Design an enzyme around this catalytic site. Sequence first.
Site, mmCIF file in Angstrom:
data_model
loop_
_atom_site.group_PDB
_atom_site.id
_atom_site.type_symbol
_atom_site.label_atom_id
_atom_site.label_comp_id
_atom_site.label_asym_id
_atom_site.label_seq_id
_atom_site.Cartn_x
_atom_site.Cartn_y
_atom_site.Cartn_z
ATOM 1 C CD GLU B 58 -2.652 1.436 2.434
ATOM 2 O OE1 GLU B 58 -1.999 1.364 3.486
ATOM 3 O OE2 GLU B 58 -3.864 1.717 2.442
ATOM 4 C CD1 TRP B 80 -6.060 0.375 -0.417
ATOM 5 C CD2 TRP B 80 -7.787 1.780 -0.397
ATOM 6 N NE1 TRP B 80 -5.701 1.458 0.372
ATOM 7 C CE2 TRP B 80 -6.768 2.323 0.387
ATOM 8 C CE3 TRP B 80 -8.985 2.483 -0.551
ATOM 9 C CZ2 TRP B 80 -6.893 3.558 1.038
ATOM 10 C CZ3 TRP B 80 -9.130 3.704 0.087
ATOM 11 C CH2 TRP B 80 -8.080 4.227 0.874
ATOM 12 C CE1 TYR B 94 -5.160 8.748 3.626
ATOM 13 C CE2 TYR B 94 -6.248 6.866 2.567
ATOM 14 C CZ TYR B 94 -6.077 7.713 3.651
ATOM 15 O OH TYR B 94 -6.844 7.528 4.776
ATOM 16 C CB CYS B 146 -8.693 7.891 8.320
ATOM 17 S SG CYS B 146 -10.317 7.272 7.739
ATOM 18 N NE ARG B 166 -11.395 11.672 7.751
ATOM 19 C CZ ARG B 166 -12.411 10.806 7.886
ATOM 20 N NH1 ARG B 166 -13.209 10.857 8.938
ATOM 21 N NH2 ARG B 166 -12.561 9.954 6.882
ATOM 22 C CG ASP B 169 -11.539 0.207 13.992
ATOM 23 O OD1 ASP B 169 -11.061 -0.311 15.005
ATOM 24 O OD2 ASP B 169 -12.411 -0.390 13.311
HETATM 25 C C1 LIG Z 1 -5.120 -4.696 7.078
HETATM 26 C C2 LIG Z 1 -5.555 -3.235 7.075
HETATM 27 C C3 LIG Z 1 -4.656 -2.203 6.782
HETATM 28 C C4 LIG Z 1 -5.093 -0.876 6.798
HETATM 29 C C5 LIG Z 1 -6.417 -0.588 7.113
HETATM 30 S S1 LIG Z 1 -6.933 1.090 7.095
HETATM 31 O O1 LIG Z 1 -8.336 1.234 7.819
HETATM 32 O O2 LIG Z 1 -5.872 2.014 7.820
HETATM 33 N N1 LIG Z 1 -7.060 1.673 5.439
HETATM 34 C C6 LIG Z 1 -6.725 0.680 4.402
HETATM 35 C C7 LIG Z 1 -7.978 0.605 3.547
HETATM 36 C C8 LIG Z 1 -8.593 1.999 3.660
HETATM 37 C C9 LIG Z 1 -8.218 2.498 5.073
HETATM 38 C C10 LIG Z 1 -7.961 4.011 5.231
HETATM 39 O O3 LIG Z 1 -6.671 4.453 5.139
HETATM 40 O O4 LIG Z 1 -8.872 4.818 5.446
HETATM 41 C C11 LIG Z 1 -7.333 -1.594 7.395
HETATM 42 C C12 LIG Z 1 -6.889 -2.922 7.379
#
Ligand SMILES: Cc1ccc(S(=O)(=O)N2CCC[C@@H]2C(=O)O)cc1
Lengths: 264, 264
Positions: B58, B80, B94, B146, B166, B169
């Site tokens: 990512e 995603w 992003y 986020c 912002r 979880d």
């Molecule tokens: C395994 C995992 C990595 C990262 C995320 S996350 O919530 O930080 N992230 C990845 C998908 C979209 C979301 C975000 O940056 O909002 C969730 C699960």
Amino acid sequence: MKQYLELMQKVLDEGTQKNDRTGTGTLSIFGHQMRFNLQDGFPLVTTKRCHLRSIIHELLWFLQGDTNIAYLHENNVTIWDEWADENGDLGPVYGKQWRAWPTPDGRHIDQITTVLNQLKNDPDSRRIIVSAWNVGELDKMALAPCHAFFQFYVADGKLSCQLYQRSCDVFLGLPFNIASYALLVHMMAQQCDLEVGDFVWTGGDTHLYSNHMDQTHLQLSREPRPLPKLIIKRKPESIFDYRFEDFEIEGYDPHPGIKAPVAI
Amino acid sequence: MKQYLELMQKVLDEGTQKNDRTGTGTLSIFGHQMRFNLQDGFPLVTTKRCHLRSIIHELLWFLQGDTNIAYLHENNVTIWDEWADENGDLGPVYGKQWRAWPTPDGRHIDQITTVLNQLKNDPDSRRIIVSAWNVGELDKMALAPCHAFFQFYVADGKLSCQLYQRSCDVFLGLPFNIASYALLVHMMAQQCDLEVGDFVWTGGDTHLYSNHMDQTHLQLSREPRPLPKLIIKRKPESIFDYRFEDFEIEGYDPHPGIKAPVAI
Ligand SMILES: Cc1ccc(S(=O)(=O)N2CCC[C@@H]2C(=O)O)cc1
Ligand SMILES: Cc1ccc(S(=O)(=O)N2CCC[C@@H]2C(=O)O)cc1
Ligand SMILES: Cc1ccc(S(=O)(=O)N2CCC[C@@H]2C(=O)O)cc1
Ligand SMILES: Cc1ccc(S(=O)(=O)N2CCC[C@@H]2C(=O)O)cc1
């Protein structure tokens, strides 16, 4: 105030020697956070006398979306004078981004109205944000935003707000930055029929100038006094209709004013 | 890790009952800050097994400026997928803001190159910032950022970075958000010939979902283990030339993996 003095002592105890763009040296820490429960009292520093006249006019001017300093000059507020050009212009600083952030497709976004709308209709939102950090406009600004972005939050009938301040002069600017955003929280809360919650201050490069060291020692020898109380004498029909005279600070009993010289 | 577990306990002890946009309830606090000294070890949660394969791909994809998920799909990274449309598009999330923030005059701003330039030529700057919070583009994004903005800082040969998140979880996303930015600090530091400093995490609405309460209790009963060590096997010629295989985590010995169900 206790949190403010703790931050001063922290910079002194652990700040690292670092110069600014001018060449004036500072002691600096990176990353700090403080919380002010606005129900405990208006967070105006009591260990030195802090005037709010300029701050109140500045906030009203920011909310109007104006970046020309003639309104400030109509009221003999001169805090933006050193950045303004001959016509009184500052470029698209704070106010222009809050009220009319320009987009690639030609729109001007009103972030203050957007956030009021979100607070009244979707208070649980996790994206009730105002940003002044408009990357494509930074070059036109007299200076890049120090108080760069802020987020609101609602819980149990109370309005809180977190500010991210990228650069902070703890002695000279911080007292005023806190009061400004605390005033805005009160005004937004009043307009949304909410009680005031917390003002959370988060700092990036948080420093003390080396020529403010004696002043800092003097202020650290003083005991904070009880916080004053903000009174809003009238309830305007909107967030853009507040007037200087609407605000009164009650019970402010600070230690004497301490001056801050600045190099040029 | 100690700071992470302290944050979990804090949300449990003082979070307020609050629903998300979906309607799933949460316990929530507003405003929190944690600091990870990257010289103490790579900040990957040890109280539950956390996989970094997706996170590494990512980050590389974000740095490329790509918002279409085909690169992620070439590597079978599906995090995603739920936000992507039929063509794999996410809108200007992003990566598009990091590398090509669109301005009203038609330019595309490369904030990553700008900040590398600033770190190498003006390391004392107090405006070494990347923002993904492009107000005029939020409506086109599959979701608003986020992890919205971050600032770098240099002191005593070390690179630090503060992220403003912002919405967080704590159970599901936070472990990964920390690791992602910590990896980026290592990569930027390597490219600037600097040592790693601190990663400062600042949260806005920081919450635990109510269906993660048992998982949270279980994880809080486990003792953190020593932090692992990040090894970068090669030094690419630039920040855009890192490859998946360049990174190795050494000495990671976590407690077992804990699953997190999500409502739809
Ligand atoms: C395994 C995992 C990595 C990262 C995320 S996350 O919530 O930080 N992230 C990845 C998908 C979209 C979301 C975000 O940056 O909002 C969730 C699960
Ligand atoms: C009635 C009015 C208010 C404010 C302004 S302004 O110049 O301060 N600014 C704020 C909103 C858009 C406008 C502008 O920059 O043109 C102009 C007119
Ligand atoms: C009396 C006073 C108020 C406010 C400031 S400040 O540093 O917070 N501010 C006002 C002028 C420009 C500057 C800024 O927001 O960057 C300095 C002095
Ligand atoms: C060589 C190359 C890299 C990355 C991209 S992209 O689509 O991911 N993005 C990043 C920079 C500008 C470009 C675009 O959105 O058109 C296109 C071409």
